[PDB]
RNA sequence: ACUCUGGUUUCUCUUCAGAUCGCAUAAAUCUUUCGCACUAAAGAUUUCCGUGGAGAGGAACAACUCUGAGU
């Protein structure tokens, strides 16, 4: 790679895509050898593909290296931000059961060997936020029942798809509680322009058959 | 105050030292004089 | 016109004595180490606050330290920690402890310690070995005494008749190290507005035992002082037109001499 | 040449004429402690010789210290050369080359650059503070460089306007200062010929703030001018040294009459000065005209309206006049380039005076072979090109002349480090302006242009097609050691080359700076302190490379050592599987490494004297005292290589064939070291056995050098290894109350206070301490902030002390970001440095062995 | 304070007309003992901070220099200082007697 | 395989240009040759026992420190310092046989890709356009042609010249270790000389960079003075006659408009000057597509844009509160003509790239009709062949630069984009949006 | 060591003034920046508070201390 694309200034690190969602010690660490290897792998893959048939952009791709310098192996797949950390590599601690963590074990020996920390990709979080915004704006004169139904469908899809990753992702939980407070606000403002201090939650979460909106909850609500 | 009220003198309404505030309000007046003059000139034109 | 003044040293000594309550009796700028205007500018430009100093909004956009992607340069496995690198260290040496020193002013380094010994007893001689001074522990190709060196009768010490010290010598030596308004003997008259009587009070460090509100008052006074000293631009050339001289030149105005209370009442009535 | 120049008392043609005569030239270095008045003294001289240049009433104008960083800091950073024509006491004008050196200890290297191209040293000592740390260090360095020494006791006005001492007490303070300087000189110099005393004219009393400069001769001449009948030389002889004056007999006697009369110095010199100062500062409006008339000084009405400080400066300028006392002091005692050439050649030239070219340079003749020697590199305002500054020792340098420039590695056997360059221009270097000249004769300082390319630190300018036996001058031996290590990288790697260029430039601007690249591609800068590195990085960011640069936190360079002998005799064979070398390593005796470093022993000595020294001072065996091969990595390196191979088992002739290769391997191994790639210090290496292949082609070269390094590493590792922290010596000038507080600061940084003696005649104390360099970062700031700025400290490298921990302790657990406790600090200092260098995670004791 | 320090290490390497300022705007909340309790200036025992009562400053001063004088002053100097203090205290007592409630 | 000589010649350890030795086993540059130099330590440490002096072009074995004399190593030196004899320079353009690199990568000298350091494709295209120009390339292929000219002491512009020549010798090397050349040194010189303009990270306009580079080459090749005739001027500069006709303000009565015709100020002037390149202004996009079956992409013949310089065409020029009619008439045709077609124009809100397609022939263009009759007699030859064609693709912001170069000796046309060298058909060149063009007068 | 200018005080006008024009410190407007702008920073312009330098004019009382020059 360096024979064909020489880098005398070690400039290969300036444009290296990395997953900013994870903390600094959890991301890929841009070691010189690791960065060069990632660039070389991407360059080889790109060379295998003729440019007219298809193009593999570096800015839209992501290469993660796991070696003696990088303990975390990161990848985004199907909206899931997965980070594998081997047990024998930078763990040194007893582990409990957390919802967002997958305990990977070798099949032949049934011994735990790595932990796959799950998260929701920021792209999926932005899609959910945009869906909530569309529901809020496209409300207009629609009945509160249909607005709550749309919010419930969005929430059910998000949770049934990102089951453990929702629990693991704190930013996502904050986003859901903010969107829920928005949906309720919309209903409340519809009920009256003045802000209803200490509005009763019973109207929102009561099932439709019993006269309520039948709204699902993901935040901490104290009745 | 917290320099005036040391030693025998305690908290009380007897501290008179008005150089600083008088300075500050004169400096504010310097800045706002042209604005009020322009407003009065506009309001008293013709 | 009351624009220039010159005083004899006894008058300035008496004035310095009468104003001793408003002066900290500092004889150096070493008291203002990492706490002067340049240090405050360096702190502001680095988006950092000196403990005794004020706090400002960032001069440039700051990127969170969690955004950097663990380069070999900032690898914490290589960094040896002995003491926490404080904000004072970075302000003292902005180009060594900062990765992006921009609009930073180098603070003045150490000045020699003024060892001026302040005289308390006027009866004592002006040139006297004060007990504050550490006593010196006493202990040469000299010419032979038998030689024929003679001094002519016209020769004597240059100022043998002149006394070594006078009653107002210690006062002058004290005036040498007085604060700036008293270091001079001739100067130019200033406006009463232009004289900040308490500017040096908050320019110094806050006293150790003080409540939280007065400390914040000190910090905010320092903040506004720094803002004035930094946003300051030199005045622009004018043509020197005076409003009141023009007013007097017209027929509509006339001059007189009036009591301040009378003109205050008259101004209040005219405003109403 | 012909160009625009500022108005001066003399004429440029006279200045050029003085340069030809080498008997009227004085090469002077004004050194001293921080803020002791050297720059203000040079400014006073410039004001004297330049009518148009006047010092501001409020701001002390500094003609030298022209850098922006120098102006902002207020601390001299780089040496400024100034060439002037100064009148003597008799009126004879002398050419003076003055190298105003910085007073800060961190920039002591700068002073060294000013000591190589100077014949005399003028040490400025504050009359209030007295002798400080940098004054002692500079005295040691100057008398060790074979230079004449004189003293200027500056700021005598502090004795009058600050301490308000009685005149007799001021005399006592001055006498104590002179005695302390004499004691220091005698301690650092075996010869007692250079006794310093104001009677001999070696000492001048000055106040550069008020322009009060006088020696005994000059002030006696003032008396001669006011009273013609007195001869000034004998009077100056009688003025100092507890000699009392009897006005009944008008005679000077060692016996004090009346038991209350003051000394000659107090009666005739000090008391009139006190009266003048007190009249100006105390009785100006009421009694200044009478004393001014008595002294013959007439001041205008506008001049008498000045403030007290400008009025003092004016009155003392009118009274004392020109600084003729300084000129006397530097003319009678500082050799001219003609007189002082022989010691300079004997000390600095590598070939020695005995060589033909050394004899040629001993004459300092303008019409000889060119042997200019430049030690400074001054950057232009734009920062692109550099001018090489140095003195011309022989011949004459001409503008537009081909020149052979020799680098620090140039030798007769290997001449590759030499380049033929064309000199562009020549300037006589005054501080703020430069006088372009066509030629510069021998014995003068010059800013050669166009020769900066082949030189980094030191140059040897000579003429091409001649001087085929010319050698280089010895590279600058530095007062201290550069320790503080900082990693430097660019913010944007795309502009990496610019920073690289900048590195080169700073490597030229700072004589002791060391910039390299480690195995991990990390750019490394070595400095002497935090202020020094601050100035270096300001230059690197603003003057040379205008790019944004990231700087790592500061770390120190550790050393490596052993504390007890190797457990087993280590050995290594060549990759040829021949030439087996078996060695052991043991620590040296106490002070032996100090003896080697301080040139007390040299490998250049013959076998007889070296063996005798090692047999008498350290009680070595005769065989052990004669088998020593080399001293450490460099010349006079702290390590020692010996061979204990008895001739029965190993042929000495055969071993001598590989002696050069083994010595090279030893030096390289001691330079690198196996713990964390750091200098091996205070280790004795004994060659127990040596098999050598008989055929030349199977030995030598790349076979025995790496084998020697491997066996050295194994011997060092099997012997119990340890790390040496660098320990700085700190002197704190603090008030009496703050002394206790000082201890508190040194409590938090592993600081050991050695002494807390007061300053005689001053209300302050000098707290001396030994603080680890790694813990010294921010110590100056901590001390000044904790004591409200009343305490000031200067730290300089002192020694190497073993780190408490054990580096080869795999049981120690070290959290990534935590200040480790003392019992395993070495374990933290070894691995982390190993990560900074780019080596493996840890080193094994059998890594370099042959069994595994 | 130690937790404040270790935290510091880690952190570095890792409407309404409000007449009075808020206490959160305060600075000088240090953990280092060298910076919390800062050794005040004792200007040779003869200089005083401006504004504060002189008698309070004299009472609360460190009294180090008083010990230094009582240790270094000769007998005659002690008598001189005692006489000066006697006269000054006499004047102060006269002023206090004049200024009574 | 590891010998890359396209970068700065400084020691990797000491940053010193002095006595830079390249290690032939790992390709790293060290300092010195003696006993205690970095190169010697590296030789005894990494066991690399072969070194080449980067300035003396002599090989050494350092552990024993003796010179190496073998002709088989000569090629390495030729890679480090390519030298072109006069007969080789003359025969350069008449070269048909392919050249093999050290690796099995056949290439045509001069047709060599330039590495794309971040976004510098515009600079690579401009440098390739200036290369493949026989006279300028021949001038820069010999170091002696420009080494001996004087320079000011504090002058940095000359770094543009020598490195550029160096670049040429790297591009036209008949025997090279690789089929590509890194322009890093040349681009660093460009950035340093332009005062942070035309950076390597951020790509700039091809026309602006070409103008600045030609002007800087012309200025730097004038030694300590403005040499009126440099190689840049001799090759690319021509003389053109500007007929500036001032105009009255349009908001005036016709009587005053004709009265101003007697002012002797609003008439044709003689502002004849020298043009380094011709700036051709495309007609505005047709906005609405034509009703015909043709594509929405506009098409304009080369002679139509080359009509402002016919002599009678009057293009309006209007500065602030003033009007002009700048008539243009060529008076001296340079041997190599440069067309700078104006694509990117700043409208009221953004920058629009003109999609007009220039219909130009690539083998015969006669400019005899654009020269004055007294001028037509001077030039015997006016038949121009297109030899270089810089084309900009994509949006004005995220644009890319490629070049079509005519390889002499053969007749093939090659499209170069960074490291991509394709064999383009001669017919397809006119289809792309031509940005800059270089024509040879024959 | 004897002669002859330059005087000081005050009022007003004009002009320059990047000088800390000011050992003090305000207001407005626009742009920019992240918040979401009294409680916020950056950049720029302008207006007020009032100076210094030079020149001119007016009127008040001093005329050779000083700066010197002519001796
Ligand atoms: O506003 P602060 O500076 O904190 O001062 C207020 C109060 O002011 P207000 O009347 O505006 O609330 C008084 O100050 P003045 O009215 O006298 O200016 C009073 O002062 P005295 O006790 O000196 O009369 C006292 O200030 P302090 O207690 O600091 O002396 C009190 O403070 P608190 O609000 O903290 O009680």
Residue numbers in the entry:
A (entry chain A): 1113 to 1335
B (entry chain A): 613 to 658
C (entry chain A): 224 to 362, 369 to 501
D (entry chain C): 105 to 956
E (entry chain G): 242 to 255, 270 to 356
F (entry chain U): 114 to 201, 203 to 556
Reported in the publication:
Here cryo-electron microscopy analyses of human CE pre-B complex and B-like complexes reveal extensive structural similarities with their CI counterparts. The molecular triggers and roles of B-specific proteins in these rearrangements are also identified.
Single-particle cryo-electron microscopy (cryo-EM) followed by 3D reconstructions of the purified CE pre-B complexes revealed that one of the major dimer classes comprised two similar units (protomers) aligned in an antiparallel manner, whereby each of the protomers resembles a CI pre-B complex. Moreover, the BRR2 helicase domain has not yet translocated to the PRP8 endonuclease-like (En) domain (PRP8En) nor docked with its U4 snRNA substrate. Furthermore, U4/U6 stem III and the so-called U4 snRNA quasi-pseudoknot are present.
